Amino acid sequence: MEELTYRLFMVATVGMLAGTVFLLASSREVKPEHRRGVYISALVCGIAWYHYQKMGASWESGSYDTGLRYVDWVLTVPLMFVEVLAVTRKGAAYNEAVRNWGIAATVMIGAGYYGETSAAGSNEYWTGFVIAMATYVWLMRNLQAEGEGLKGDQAVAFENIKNLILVGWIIYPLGYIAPVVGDFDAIREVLYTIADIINKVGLGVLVLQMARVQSGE
């Protein structure tokens, strides 16, 4: 389980670099005016690459620091919302959502950190879980209500972004509780790494598909 967890960090390290550079090279496939989302997805993949390098070395040391994962999440999740909100919003409406979602994300991730760095099953562990789950549900319900005014191909492209988030982000709370269901500490790390690859690489690809639709492809 330990050696599988290590190999998955290394697979995910190269996966995030490939995400980064695949998206940068793919930016020539779309009109300059729809490229900003692709550049941000590459920056999200790039921050993750940098932290996955650290997390792999941290795991291989025998003294894993979950701080490296949670710092990755506090930076990348708000960048991922900057992308999604830009499909449907501009001016004050964009700035207010980015502010409000950004606060919610930071509280979600901070609470998770507080609980994860407590003993599994302790009142601290559950307090963290419940406060993060509530915030998570607030974000997902906000996300579900975005894009009522989109038409045709742009509407379907955005629905694919939303469904990837609505389904892919469920893996994080499953990872968080893995260590109470069994003697499976390393399975938390496995589930988080798979989620990060699906969610960062998957979102990169769907943001690219959106940039192609908006370019009239």
Ligand X SMILES: *C/C=C(C)/C=C/C=C(C)/C=C/C1=C(C)CCCC1(C)C
Ligand Y SMILES: CCCCCCCCCCCCCCCCCCCC
* Contact footprint for ligand CCCCCC (CB under 6 A): 47, 75, 96, 99, 133, 137, 170
Task: List own/partner pairs for 132-135 with CB under 8 A and 24 or more apart.
Answer: 132/107, 132/108, 132/173, 132/176, 133/173, 135/104, 135/105, 135/107, 135/108, 135/111
When asked if residue 125 is in the footprint of ligand X (CB under 6 A), the reply is no
When asked if residue 139 is in the footprint of ligand KR (CB under 6 A), the reply is yes
The CA distances from residue 212 to 28, 135, 150, in Å, are: 10, 32, 16
Could you tell which of ligand KR, ligand X, ligand CCCCCC, none binds residue 75, using a CB distance below 5 to 8 A set by kind? ligand CCCCCC
Nearest of 72, 22, 69 to residue 42 by alpha carbon: 22
Cβ proximity to ligand Y, 67 vs 120, nearer residue: 67
Cβ proximity to ligand KR, 116 vs 189, nearer residue: 189
The residue with its CB nearest to ligand KR is: 15
Identity (one letter) of the amino acid at 11?
V
When asked if residue 82 is in the footprint of ligand Y (CB under 6 A), the reply is no
> Which of these segments, 35-43, 59-67, 84-92, 182-190, binds ligand Y (CB under 6 A)?
35-43
Cβ proximity to ligand KR, 117 vs 137, nearer residue: 137
Residue 65 CA to residue 11 CA, distance in Å, equals: 19
- At closest approach, how far in Å is the CB of 117 from ligand KR? 18
List residues near ligand X by CB under 6 A.
73, 76-77, 80, 108-109, 112, 129, 132-133, 136, 169, 172-173, 176, 196, 199-200
